[PDB]
Amino acid sequence: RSGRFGGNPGGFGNQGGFGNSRGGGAGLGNNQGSNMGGGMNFGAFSINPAMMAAAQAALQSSWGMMGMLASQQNQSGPSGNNQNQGNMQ
Amino acid sequence: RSGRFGGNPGGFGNQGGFGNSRGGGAGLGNNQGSNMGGGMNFGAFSINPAMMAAAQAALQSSWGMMGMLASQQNQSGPSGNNQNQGNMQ
Amino acid sequence: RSGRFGGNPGGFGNQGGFGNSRGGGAGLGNNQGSNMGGGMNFGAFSINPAMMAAAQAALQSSWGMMGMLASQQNQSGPSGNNQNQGNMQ
Amino acid sequence: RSGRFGGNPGGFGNQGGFGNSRGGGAGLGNNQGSNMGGGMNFGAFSINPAMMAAAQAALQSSWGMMGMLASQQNQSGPSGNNQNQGNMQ
Amino acid sequence: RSGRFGGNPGGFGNQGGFGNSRGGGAGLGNNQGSNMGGGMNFGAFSINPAMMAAAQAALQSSWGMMGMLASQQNQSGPSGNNQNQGNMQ
């Protein structure tokens, strides 16, 4: 057994004011042989976020436990494309 | 047994003010041999979010437990395309 | 047994003010050999969201437990297309 | 047994103000060998959302437990198409 | 058994003021043979965040326990593309 994470509860008491936090958890954990990105925005529990992303990319991944024996992965990336995106006003 | 996550409950007490948090969880966890992205926006529990994404990409992934034996994955990416997207006003 | 997630209940007490949170959960978890993206917007429980996405892409994935033995996946991506999308006013 | 998710109930107490939340859940979970995207908008429980998506894409996926033995998947993507979409005013 | 993380609960007591924290957790942990990036923004539990990312990239990863025997990974990156993204006002 492996890859455990504990809880982050809020606890006992009142809360007031501006931009405070108690307990909570955020991030990227326990992923196996996976790809995340190549042009991606992620936003949660937030006030007025603004985000811009632009990517020309190639990603390749692999995980094996008594696996990937006498095998092959082959990838050729994007070639010769044209793309235009307008304004947000 | 593996890959456990604890709960993040809010707890006991009142809450007032501006932009506070107690307990909660957000992110990307326990994915196996998967792809996420290549032009994607994600927004939840938020006020006035604004997001722009543009991608030219290739993604390839694999997971095996007594698997992927004497096998092959082959990928050729996008080639020679044209794309135009207008304005948001 | 594996891949467990705890609950994030709200708890006991009153709530007022502007943009506060207690308990809750959001994201991408426990996916196996799947693809998510290539031009996608996702929005939930939000006020005035604005989102633009544009993609030229190829995605390929695989998961095997005593599987994918002496097998093959082959993919050739998009080639030679034209696309125009107008304005939103 | 695997792939469990806990409940996110609202709890006990009053609620007033602007843009607050208690309990709740949103996202993408426990999918096996599936495809999601290639030009898709998703919106739920929201006020005045605006979304634009444009895609030229290919997606391919597979899941096997004592499966996918001596087998094949073959895909050739879109080629030589023309498409125009007008304005929303 | 390995790769354990303890909980960061909030504890017992009241909380007021401006920008304080008690307990909590944030980051990237326990990933195996995976890729994260190539044009990506991530924001959670925040007030007025602003983020810009631009990438021309290639990423390649691998994990094996009695795996990756007599095998190969081959990657050729993006070549000859053009991309323009507009303003956010």
CSV table of C-alpha atoms in Angstrom, one decimal:
chain,number,residue,atom,x,y,z
A,1,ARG,CA,0.0,0.0,0.0
A,2,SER,CA,1.3,3.5,-0.9
A,3,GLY,CA,0.5,7.0,-2.1
A,4,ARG,CA,-1.7,8.3,0.8
A,5,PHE,CA,-2.8,11.8,1.5
A,6,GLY,CA,-4.3,13.2,4.8
A,7,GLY,CA,-7.4,15.4,5.1
A,8,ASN,CA,-7.2,19.1,5.6
A,9,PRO,CA,-10.5,20.0,7.5
A,10,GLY,CA,-11.3,23.6,8.6
A,11,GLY,CA,-11.5,23.0,12.4
A,12,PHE,CA,-13.5,24.7,15.2
A,13,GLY,CA,-14.0,28.5,15.5
A,14,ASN,CA,-15.4,31.7,13.7
A,15,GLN,CA,-13.9,33.4,10.7
A,16,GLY,CA,-14.1,37.0,9.4
A,17,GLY,CA,-12.0,39.7,7.6
A,18,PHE,CA,-10.4,39.8,4.1
A,19,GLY,CA,-8.6,36.9,2.2
A,20,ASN,CA,-8.0,34.5,5.2
A,21,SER,CA,-7.8,30.6,4.9
A,22,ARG,CA,-8.0,27.6,7.2
A,23,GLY,CA,-7.3,24.0,6.1
A,24,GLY,CA,-7.7,23.2,2.3
A,25,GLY,CA,-5.7,21.4,-0.4
A,26,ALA,CA,-4.7,22.2,-4.1
A,27,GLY,CA,-2.4,20.8,-6.7
A,28,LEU,CA,-1.4,17.7,-8.9
A,29,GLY,CA,-0.8,14.3,-7.1
A,30,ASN,CA,-0.3,10.6,-7.8
A,31,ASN,CA,-0.5,10.6,-11.6
A,32,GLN,CA,1.0,7.6,-13.4
A,33,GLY,CA,2.2,7.7,-17.1
A,34,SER,CA,-0.1,10.7,-18.0
A,35,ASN,CA,0.2,14.1,-19.9
A,36,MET,CA,-1.2,17.4,-18.6
A,37,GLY,CA,-0.8,20.7,-20.6
A,38,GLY,CA,-0.1,21.8,-24.2
A,39,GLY,CA,-2.4,24.8,-23.9
A,40,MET,CA,-4.6,24.6,-20.8
A,41,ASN,CA,-6.1,27.1,-18.2
A,42,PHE,CA,-7.5,25.8,-14.8
A,43,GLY,CA,-9.3,28.1,-12.3
A,44,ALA,CA,-11.3,27.2,-9.2
A,45,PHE,CA,-12.8,29.0,-6.1
A,46,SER,CA,-11.4,32.4,-7.3
A,47,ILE,CA,-12.4,36.1,-7.8
A,48,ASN,CA,-11.8,37.9,-11.3
A,49,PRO,CA,-9.1,35.6,-12.7
A,50,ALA,CA,-7.5,36.5,-16.1
A,51,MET,CA,-5.5,33.9,-18.1
A,52,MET,CA,-3.8,33.6,-21.6
A,53,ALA,CA,-2.0,30.5,-22.9
A,54,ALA,CA,-0.3,29.7,-26.3
A,55,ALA,CA,1.5,26.4,-27.2
A,56,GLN,CA,3.4,24.6,-30.0
A,57,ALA,CA,4.3,21.3,-28.3
A,58,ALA,CA,4.8,17.5,-28.2
A,59,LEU,CA,4.4,15.3,-25.1
A,60,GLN,CA,5.1,11.5,-24.7
A,61,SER,CA,4.8,9.3,-21.5
A,62,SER,CA,4.9,5.6,-20.2
A,63,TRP,CA,4.6,3.5,-17.0
A,64,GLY,CA,5.2,-0.2,-16.7
A,65,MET,CA,5.3,-2.8,-13.9
A,66,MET,CA,6.2,-6.1,-15.6
A,67,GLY,CA,5.1,-4.2,-18.7
A,68,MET,CA,6.6,-2.5,-21.8
A,69,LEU,CA,8.6,-5.5,-22.9
A,70,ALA,CA,10.0,-5.7,-26.5
A,71,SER,CA,7.6,-2.8,-27.5
A,72,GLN,CA,7.8,0.6,-29.2
A,73,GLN,CA,6.3,4.2,-29.0
A,74,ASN,CA,6.8,6.4,-32.1
A,75,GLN,CA,5.6,10.1,-32.5
A,76,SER,CA,6.1,12.8,-35.2
A,77,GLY,CA,5.0,16.3,-34.1
A,78,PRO,CA,2.8,19.0,-35.9
A,79,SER,CA,4.3,20.4,-39.2
A,80,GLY,CA,3.3,23.2,-41.5
A,81,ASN,CA,0.1,24.6,-39.9
A,82,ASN,CA,-1.4,28.2,-39.7
A,83,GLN,CA,-3.6,29.6,-36.9
A,84,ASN,CA,-5.1,33.0,-36.0
A,85,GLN,CA,-7.2,33.9,-32.8
A,86,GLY,CA,-8.9,37.3,-32.4
A,87,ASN,CA,-9.3,39.8,-29.5
A,88,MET,CA,-11.5,39.7,-26.3
A,89,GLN,CA,-12.9,43.1,-25.5
B,1,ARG,CA,-4.7,-0.9,-1.7
B,2,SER,CA,-3.3,2.6,-2.6
B,3,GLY,CA,-4.1,6.1,-3.9
B,4,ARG,CA,-6.2,7.4,-1.0
B,5,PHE,CA,-7.4,11.0,-0.4
B,6,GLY,CA,-8.8,12.4,2.9
B,7,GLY,CA,-11.9,14.6,3.1
B,8,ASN,CA,-11.7,18.4,3.5
B,9,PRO,CA,-15.0,19.4,5.4
B,10,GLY,CA,-15.8,23.0,6.4
B,11,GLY,CA,-16.0,22.5,10.2
B,12,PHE,CA,-18.0,24.2,13.0
B,13,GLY,CA,-18.5,28.0,13.2
B,14,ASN,CA,-19.8,31.2,11.4
B,15,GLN,CA,-18.3,32.8,8.3
B,16,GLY,CA,-18.5,36.5,7.0
B,17,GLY,CA,-16.3,39.0,5.2
B,18,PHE,CA,-14.7,39.0,1.7
B,19,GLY,CA,-13.0,36.2,-0.1
B,20,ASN,CA,-12.4,33.7,2.8
B,21,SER,CA,-12.2,29.9,2.6
B,22,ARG,CA,-12.4,26.9,5.0
B,23,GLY,CA,-11.8,23.3,3.9
B,24,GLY,CA,-12.2,22.4,0.2
B,25,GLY,CA,-10.2,20.6,-2.5
B,26,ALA,CA,-9.2,21.3,-6.1
B,27,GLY,CA,-6.8,19.8,-8.8
B,28,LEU,CA,-5.8,16.7,-10.8
B,29,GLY,CA,-5.3,13.3,-9.1
B,30,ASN,CA,-4.8,9.5,-9.6
B,31,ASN,CA,-5.0,9.6,-13.5
B,32,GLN,CA,-3.5,6.5,-15.2
B,33,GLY,CA,-2.3,6.5,-18.9
B,34,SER,CA,-4.6,9.5,-19.9
B,35,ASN,CA,-4.3,12.8,-21.8
B,36,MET,CA,-5.6,16.2,-20.6
B,37,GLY,CA,-5.2,19.5,-22.7
B,38,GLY,CA,-4.4,20.5,-26.3
B,39,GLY,CA,-6.7,23.5,-26.1
B,40,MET,CA,-9.0,23.4,-23.0
B,41,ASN,CA,-10.4,25.9,-20.4
B,42,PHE,CA,-11.8,24.8,-17.0
B,43,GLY,CA,-13.6,27.1,-14.5
B,44,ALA,CA,-15.7,26.3,-11.4
B,45,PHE,CA,-17.2,28.2,-8.4
B,46,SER,CA,-15.8,31.5,-9.6
B,47,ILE,CA,-16.8,35.2,-10.2
B,48,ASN,CA,-16.1,36.9,-13.7
B,49,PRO,CA,-13.4,34.5,-15.1
B,50,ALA,CA,-11.8,35.4,-18.5
B,51,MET,CA,-9.7,32.7,-20.4
B,52,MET,CA,-8.1,32.3,-23.9
B,53,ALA,CA,-6.3,29.2,-25.1
B,54,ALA,CA,-4.6,28.3,-28.5
B,55,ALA,CA,-2.8,25.0,-29.3
B,56,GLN,CA,-0.9,23.2,-32.1
B,57,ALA,CA,-0.1,19.9,-30.4
B,58,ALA,CA,0.4,16.1,-30.2
B,59,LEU,CA,-0.1,13.9,-27.0
B,60,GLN,CA,0.6,10.1,-26.5
B,61,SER,CA,0.3,8.0,-23.3
B,62,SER,CA,0.4,4.4,-22.0
B,63,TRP,CA,0.0,2.3,-18.7
B,64,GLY,CA,0.7,-1.5,-18.3
B,65,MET,CA,0.7,-4.0,-15.5
B,66,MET,CA,1.5,-7.3,-17.1
B,67,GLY,CA,0.5,-5.5,-20.3
B,68,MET,CA,2.0,-3.8,-23.4
B,69,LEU,CA,4.0,-6.9,-24.4
B,70,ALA,CA,5.4,-7.1,-28.0
B,71,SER,CA,3.1,-4.2,-29.0
B,72,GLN,CA,3.2,-0.8,-30.8
B,73,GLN,CA,1.8,2.7,-30.7
B,74,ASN,CA,2.3,4.9,-33.9
B,75,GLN,CA,1.2,8.6,-34.3
B,76,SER,CA,1.7,11.2,-37.1
B,77,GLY,CA,0.6,14.7,-36.0
B,78,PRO,CA,-1.5,17.4,-37.8
B,79,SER,CA,0.0,18.8,-41.2
B,80,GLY,CA,-1.0,21.6,-43.6
B,81,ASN,CA,-4.2,23.0,-42.0
B,82,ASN,CA,-5.6,26.6,-41.9
B,83,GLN,CA,-7.9,28.1,-39.1
B,84,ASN,CA,-9.3,31.6,-38.2
B,85,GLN,CA,-11.4,32.5,-35.2
B,86,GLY,CA,-13.1,35.9,-34.8
B,87,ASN,CA,-13.5,38.4,-31.9
B,88,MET,CA,-15.7,38.4,-28.8
B,89,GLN,CA,-17.1,41.9,-28.0
C,1,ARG,CA,-9.3,-1.7,-3.3
C,2,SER,CA,-8.0,1.7,-4.4
C,3,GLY,CA,-8.7,5.2,-5.7
C,4,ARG,CA,-10.8,6.6,-2.8
C,5,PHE,CA,-11.9,10.2,-2.3
C,6,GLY,CA,-13.4,11.7,0.9
C,7,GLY,CA,-16.5,13.9,1.2
C,8,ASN,CA,-16.2,17.7,1.5
C,9,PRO,CA,-19.5,18.7,3.3
C,10,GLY,CA,-20.3,22.3,4.2
C,11,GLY,CA,-20.5,21.9,8.1
C,12,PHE,CA,-22.5,23.7,10.8
C,13,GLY,CA,-23.0,27.6,10.9
C,14,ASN,CA,-24.3,30.7,9.1
C,15,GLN,CA,-22.7,32.3,6.0
C,16,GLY,CA,-22.9,35.9,4.6
C,17,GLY,CA,-20.7,38.4,2.7
C,18,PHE,CA,-19.0,38.3,-0.8
C,19,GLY,CA,-17.3,35.4,-2.5
C,20,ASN,CA,-16.8,33.0,0.5
C,21,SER,CA,-16.6,29.2,0.4
C,22,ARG,CA,-16.9,26.2,2.8
C,23,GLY,CA,-16.3,22.6,1.8
C,24,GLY,CA,-16.7,21.7,-1.9
C,25,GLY,CA,-14.7,19.8,-4.6
C,26,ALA,CA,-13.6,20.4,-8.2
C,27,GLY,CA,-11.3,18.8,-10.8
C,28,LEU,CA,-10.3,15.7,-12.8
C,29,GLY,CA,-9.8,12.3,-11.0
C,30,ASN,CA,-9.4,8.5,-11.5
C,31,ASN,CA,-9.5,8.5,-15.3
C,32,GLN,CA,-8.0,5.3,-17.0
C,33,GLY,CA,-6.9,5.3,-20.7
C,34,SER,CA,-9.1,8.3,-21.7
C,35,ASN,CA,-8.7,11.6,-23.7
C,36,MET,CA,-10.1,15.0,-22.6
C,37,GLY,CA,-9.6,18.2,-24.7
C,38,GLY,CA,-8.8,19.1,-28.3
C,39,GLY,CA,-11.1,22.2,-28.2
C,40,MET,CA,-13.3,22.2,-25.1
C,41,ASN,CA,-14.8,24.8,-22.6
C,42,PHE,CA,-16.2,23.7,-19.2
C,43,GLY,CA,-18.0,26.1,-16.7
C,44,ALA,CA,-20.1,25.3,-13.6
C,45,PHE,CA,-21.6,27.3,-10.7
C,46,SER,CA,-20.1,30.6,-12.0
C,47,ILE,CA,-21.1,34.3,-12.6
C,48,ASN,CA,-20.4,35.9,-16.1
C,49,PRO,CA,-17.7,33.5,-17.4
C,50,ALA,CA,-16.1,34.2,-20.9
C,51,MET,CA,-14.0,31.5,-22.7
C,52,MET,CA,-12.3,31.1,-26.2
C,53,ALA,CA,-10.6,27.9,-27.4
C,54,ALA,CA,-8.9,27.0,-30.7
C,55,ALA,CA,-7.1,23.7,-31.5
C,56,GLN,CA,-5.2,21.7,-34.2
C,57,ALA,CA,-4.4,18.4,-32.4
C,58,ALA,CA,-4.0,14.6,-32.2
C,59,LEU,CA,-4.5,12.5,-28.9
C,60,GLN,CA,-3.8,8.7,-28.4
C,61,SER,CA,-4.1,6.7,-25.1
C,62,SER,CA,-4.1,3.1,-23.7
C,63,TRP,CA,-4.5,1.1,-20.4
C,64,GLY,CA,-3.9,-2.7,-20.0
C,65,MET,CA,-4.0,-5.2,-17.1
C,66,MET,CA,-3.1,-8.5,-18.7
C,67,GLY,CA,-4.1,-6.7,-21.9
C,68,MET,CA,-2.6,-5.1,-25.0
C,69,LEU,CA,-0.6,-8.2,-25.9
C,70,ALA,CA,0.8,-8.6,-29.5
C,71,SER,CA,-1.5,-5.7,-30.6
C,72,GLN,CA,-1.3,-2.3,-32.4
C,73,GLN,CA,-2.7,1.3,-32.4
C,74,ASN,CA,-2.1,3.4,-35.6
C,75,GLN,CA,-3.2,7.1,-36.1
C,76,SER,CA,-2.7,9.7,-38.9
C,77,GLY,CA,-3.8,13.2,-38.0
C,78,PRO,CA,-5.8,15.9,-39.8
C,79,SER,CA,-4.4,17.1,-43.2
C,80,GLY,CA,-5.2,19.9,-45.6
C,81,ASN,CA,-8.5,21.4,-44.1
C,82,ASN,CA,-9.8,25.0,-44.1
C,83,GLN,CA,-12.1,26.5,-41.3
C,84,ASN,CA,-13.5,30.1,-40.5
C,85,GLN,CA,-15.7,31.0,-37.5
C,86,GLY,CA,-17.3,34.5,-37.2
C,87,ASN,CA,-17.7,37.1,-34.3
C,88,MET,CA,-19.9,37.1,-31.2
C,89,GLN,CA,-21.3,40.7,-30.5
D,1,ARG,CA,-14.0,-2.6,-5.0
D,2,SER,CA,-12.6,0.8,-6.1
D,3,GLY,CA,-13.3,4.3,-7.5
D,4,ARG,CA,-15.4,5.7,-4.7
D,5,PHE,CA,-16.5,9.4,-4.2
D,6,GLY,CA,-18.0,10.9,-1.0
D,7,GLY,CA,-21.0,13.2,-0.8
D,8,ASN,CA,-20.8,17.0,-0.6
D,9,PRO,CA,-24.0,18.1,1.2
D,10,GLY,CA,-24.8,21.7,2.1
D,11,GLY,CA,-25.0,21.4,5.9
D,12,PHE,CA,-27.0,23.3,8.6
D,13,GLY,CA,-27.4,27.1,8.7
D,14,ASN,CA,-28.7,30.2,6.8
D,15,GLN,CA,-27.1,31.7,3.6
D,16,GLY,CA,-27.3,35.3,2.2
D,17,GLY,CA,-25.0,37.7,0.2
D,18,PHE,CA,-23.4,37.6,-3.2
D,19,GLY,CA,-21.7,34.6,-4.9
D,20,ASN,CA,-21.2,32.3,-1.9
D,21,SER,CA,-21.0,28.4,-1.9
D,22,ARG,CA,-21.3,25.5,0.6
D,23,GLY,CA,-20.8,21.9,-0.4
D,24,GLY,CA,-21.1,20.9,-4.1
D,25,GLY,CA,-19.1,18.9,-6.7
D,26,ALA,CA,-18.0,19.5,-10.3
D,27,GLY,CA,-15.7,17.8,-12.9
D,28,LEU,CA,-14.8,14.7,-14.8
D,29,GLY,CA,-14.3,11.4,-12.9
D,30,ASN,CA,-13.9,7.5,-13.3
D,31,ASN,CA,-14.1,7.4,-17.2
D,32,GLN,CA,-12.6,4.2,-18.8
D,33,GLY,CA,-11.4,4.1,-22.5
D,34,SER,CA,-13.5,7.1,-23.6
D,35,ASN,CA,-13.2,10.4,-25.6
D,36,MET,CA,-14.5,13.8,-24.6
D,37,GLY,CA,-14.0,17.0,-26.7
D,38,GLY,CA,-13.2,17.8,-30.4
D,39,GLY,CA,-15.4,20.9,-30.3
D,40,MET,CA,-17.7,21.0,-27.2
D,41,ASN,CA,-19.1,23.6,-24.8
D,42,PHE,CA,-20.6,22.6,-21.3
D,43,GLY,CA,-22.4,25.0,-18.9
D,44,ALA,CA,-24.5,24.4,-15.8
D,45,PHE,CA,-25.9,26.4,-12.9
D,46,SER,CA,-24.5,29.7,-14.3
D,47,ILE,CA,-25.4,33.4,-15.0
D,48,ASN,CA,-24.7,34.9,-18.5
D,49,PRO,CA,-22.0,32.5,-19.8
D,50,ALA,CA,-20.4,33.1,-23.2
D,51,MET,CA,-18.3,30.4,-25.0
D,52,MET,CA,-16.6,29.9,-28.4
D,53,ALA,CA,-14.9,26.6,-29.6
D,54,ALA,CA,-13.2,25.6,-32.9
D,55,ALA,CA,-11.4,22.3,-33.6
D,56,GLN,CA,-9.6,20.3,-36.3
D,57,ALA,CA,-8.8,17.0,-34.4
D,58,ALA,CA,-8.4,13.2,-34.1
D,59,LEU,CA,-8.9,11.2,-30.8
D,60,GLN,CA,-8.3,7.4,-30.2
D,61,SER,CA,-8.6,5.4,-26.9
D,62,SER,CA,-8.6,1.8,-25.4
D,63,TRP,CA,-9.1,-0.1,-22.1
D,64,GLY,CA,-8.5,-3.9,-21.6
D,65,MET,CA,-8.6,-6.3,-18.6
D,66,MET,CA,-7.8,-9.7,-20.2
D,67,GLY,CA,-8.7,-7.9,-23.4
D,68,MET,CA,-7.2,-6.4,-26.6
D,69,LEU,CA,-5.2,-9.5,-27.5
D,70,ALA,CA,-3.8,-10.0,-31.0
D,71,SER,CA,-6.0,-7.1,-32.2
D,72,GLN,CA,-5.8,-3.7,-34.1
D,73,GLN,CA,-7.2,-0.1,-34.1
D,74,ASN,CA,-6.6,1.9,-37.4
D,75,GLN,CA,-7.6,5.6,-37.9
D,76,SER,CA,-7.1,8.1,-40.8
D,77,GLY,CA,-8.1,11.7,-39.9
D,78,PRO,CA,-10.2,14.3,-41.8
D,79,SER,CA,-8.7,15.5,-45.2
D,80,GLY,CA,-9.5,18.3,-47.7
D,81,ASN,CA,-12.7,19.8,-46.1
D,82,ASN,CA,-14.1,23.5,-46.2
D,83,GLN,CA,-16.4,25.0,-43.5
D,84,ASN,CA,-17.8,28.6,-42.8
D,85,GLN,CA,-19.9,29.6,-39.8
D,86,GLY,CA,-21.5,33.1,-39.5
D,87,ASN,CA,-21.9,35.7,-36.7
D,88,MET,CA,-24.1,35.9,-33.6
D,89,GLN,CA,-25.4,39.4,-33.0
E,1,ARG,CA,4.7,0.9,1.7
E,2,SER,CA,5.9,4.4,0.8
E,3,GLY,CA,5.1,7.9,-0.3
E,4,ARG,CA,2.9,9.1,2.6
E,5,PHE,CA,1.8,12.6,3.4
E,6,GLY,CA,0.3,13.9,6.7
E,7,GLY,CA,-2.8,16.1,7.1
E,8,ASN,CA,-2.7,19.8,7.6
E,9,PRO,CA,-5.9,20.7,9.6
E,10,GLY,CA,-6.8,24.2,10.7
E,11,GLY,CA,-7.0,23.6,14.5
E,12,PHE,CA,-8.9,25.2,17.3
E,13,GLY,CA,-9.5,29.0,17.7
E,14,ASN,CA,-10.9,32.2,16.0
E,15,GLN,CA,-9.5,34.0,13.0
E,16,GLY,CA,-9.7,37.6,11.8
E,17,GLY,CA,-7.6,40.3,10.0
E,18,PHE,CA,-6.0,40.5,6.5
E,19,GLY,CA,-4.2,37.7,4.6
E,20,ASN,CA,-3.6,35.2,7.5
E,21,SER,CA,-3.3,31.3,7.2
E,22,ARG,CA,-3.5,28.3,9.4
E,23,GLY,CA,-2.9,24.7,8.2
E,24,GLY,CA,-3.2,24.0,4.4
E,25,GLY,CA,-1.2,22.3,1.6
E,26,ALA,CA,-0.2,23.1,-2.0
E,27,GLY,CA,2.1,21.7,-4.7
E,28,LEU,CA,3.1,18.7,-6.9
E,29,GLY,CA,3.7,15.3,-5.2
E,30,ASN,CA,4.2,11.6,-5.9
E,31,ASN,CA,4.0,11.7,-9.7
E,32,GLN,CA,5.6,8.7,-11.7
E,33,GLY,CA,6.7,8.9,-15.3
E,34,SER,CA,4.4,11.9,-16.2
E,35,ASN,CA,4.6,15.3,-18.0
E,36,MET,CA,3.2,18.6,-16.6
E,37,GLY,CA,3.6,21.9,-18.6
E,38,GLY,CA,4.3,23.1,-22.1
E,39,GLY,CA,2.0,26.1,-21.8
E,40,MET,CA,-0.2,25.9,-18.7
E,41,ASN,CA,-1.8,28.2,-16.0
E,42,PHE,CA,-3.1,26.9,-12.7
E,43,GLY,CA,-4.9,29.1,-10.1
E,44,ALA,CA,-6.9,28.2,-7.0
E,45,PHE,CA,-8.4,29.9,-3.9
E,46,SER,CA,-7.1,33.3,-5.0
E,47,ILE,CA,-8.1,37.0,-5.5
E,48,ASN,CA,-7.5,38.8,-8.8
E,49,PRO,CA,-4.8,36.6,-10.4
E,50,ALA,CA,-3.2,37.6,-13.8
E,51,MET,CA,-1.2,35.0,-15.8
E,52,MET,CA,0.5,34.8,-19.3
E,53,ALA,CA,2.3,31.7,-20.7
E,54,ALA,CA,4.0,31.0,-24.1
E,55,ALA,CA,5.8,27.8,-25.1
E,56,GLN,CA,7.7,26.1,-27.9
E,57,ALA,CA,8.6,22.7,-26.3
E,58,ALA,CA,9.2,18.9,-26.3
E,59,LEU,CA,8.8,16.6,-23.2
E,60,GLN,CA,9.5,12.8,-22.8
E,61,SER,CA,9.3,10.6,-19.7
E,62,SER,CA,9.5,6.9,-18.5
E,63,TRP,CA,9.1,4.7,-15.3
E,64,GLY,CA,9.8,1.0,-15.1
E,65,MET,CA,9.9,-1.7,-12.3
E,66,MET,CA,10.8,-4.9,-14.1
E,67,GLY,CA,9.7,-2.9,-17.2
E,68,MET,CA,11.1,-1.2,-20.2
E,69,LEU,CA,13.2,-4.1,-21.4
E,70,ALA,CA,14.5,-4.3,-24.9
E,71,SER,CA,12.2,-1.4,-25.9
E,72,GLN,CA,12.3,2.1,-27.5
E,73,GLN,CA,10.8,5.6,-27.3
E,74,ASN,CA,11.2,7.9,-30.4
E,75,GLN,CA,10.1,11.6,-30.7
E,76,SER,CA,10.5,14.4,-33.3
E,77,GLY,CA,9.3,17.8,-32.2
E,78,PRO,CA,7.2,20.5,-33.9
E,79,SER,CA,8.6,22.0,-37.1
E,80,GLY,CA,7.6,24.9,-39.4
E,81,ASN,CA,4.3,26.2,-37.7
E,82,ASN,CA,2.9,29.8,-37.5
E,83,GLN,CA,0.6,31.1,-34.7
E,84,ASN,CA,-0.9,34.5,-33.7
E,85,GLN,CA,-3.0,35.3,-30.5
E,86,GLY,CA,-4.7,38.7,-30.0
E,87,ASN,CA,-5.2,41.1,-27.0
E,88,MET,CA,-7.3,40.9,-23.9
E,89,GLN,CA,-8.7,44.4,-23.0
